Every structure is written in structure tokens, then in C-alpha cells.
């Protein structure tokens, strides 16, 4: 059942953003998508349960 | 005795307000005034 449809782009560009720049060269650590999880650990910080 | 009165101040405090709550927990290190140092580091390379 031939001729599949595929994704052409190399999936993702994990680049050092405004969070991952300042975390990498200063704090010596990085996290993939600290932009996201830096917001999610503070969003469930105000309201939790 | 030049006078008998002086001008001291009150405490300035240093609390994990913003990004330092993430970096102390998600990472280890929690470099002081990282709200300002990160602002100064992001102002230099773009010219």
C-alpha cells in the first residue's frame, strides 16, 4: 500500500532562547524548553490541587 | 563631636522573586539578581 506521506523538516530546532541562553552559560545547566516548564511550575504554583 | 546624630538606613532584603525560584529548583544554582544580570547579558550581543 505504497507512496506514503512523510514529514520533510528535521523535526524541531532546539535553539538557545532567552531562557536557555542565560541558563546555559551562567548556571552551567540547560533544560529542553525551559520556556514552557518555567511557566508551568509557576502556573500550578498559584492554583494547585 | 561633630554632631550627636547620624543617618542610618533600614534592611534591604533579597528574596527569590521570579526566575530564581525556577533555577534553585529546576537547576541547582541561584545566582543573585538574575533578573538584572540576565537583562544585562541579553543587552550586549545584539548591538
Task: Give descriptors for this structure.
part of a larger assembly; 0% strand; mainly alpha; Major capsid protein; viral protein; flat; 2 chains; Portal vertex
Summarize the structure.
With 49 residues, chain A is an all-alpha fold. Chain A is built from 2 helices and no strands. Chain B: Belongs to the herpesviridae major capsid protein family.
Description:
The structure is cut from a larger assembly and holds two copies of chain A. By secondary structure, chain A is mainly alpha-helical. Helices cover 43% and strands 0% of the residues of chain A. Chain A is built from two helices and no strands. At the A-B interface, helix 1 and helix 2 of A face helix 1 and helix 2 of B. The PDB classes it as viral protein. The entry lists the keywords HSV2, Portal vertex, Complex, viral protein. Structure of HSV2 B-capsid portal vertex. Chains A, B: Major capsid protein.
Helix content of chain A: 40-55%
Task: Indicate the structural class of chain A.
Answer: mainly alpha
Number of helices of chain A: 2
Largest sheet of chain A: none
Oligomer: part of a larger assembly
SS strand fraction of chain A: under 5%
SSE string of chain A, helices as H and strands as E: HH
The radius of gyration over CA of chain A amounts to 17 Å
Most extensive contact: A-B, 14 and 15 residues
End-to-end span of chain A in angstroms?
49 Å
Overall geometric form of chain A: flat
Using DSSP, what is the number of strands of chain A? 0
Amino acid at each position: 500500500e505504497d507512496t506514503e506521506a512523510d514529514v520533510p523538516v528535521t523535526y524541531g530546532e532546539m535553539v538557545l532562547n532567552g531562557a536557555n541562553l542565560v541558563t546555559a552559560l551562567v548556571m552551567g545547566k540547560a533544560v529542553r524548553s525551559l520556556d514552557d516548564v518555567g511557566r508551568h511550575l509557576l502556573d500550578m504554583q498559584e492554583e494547585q490541587l
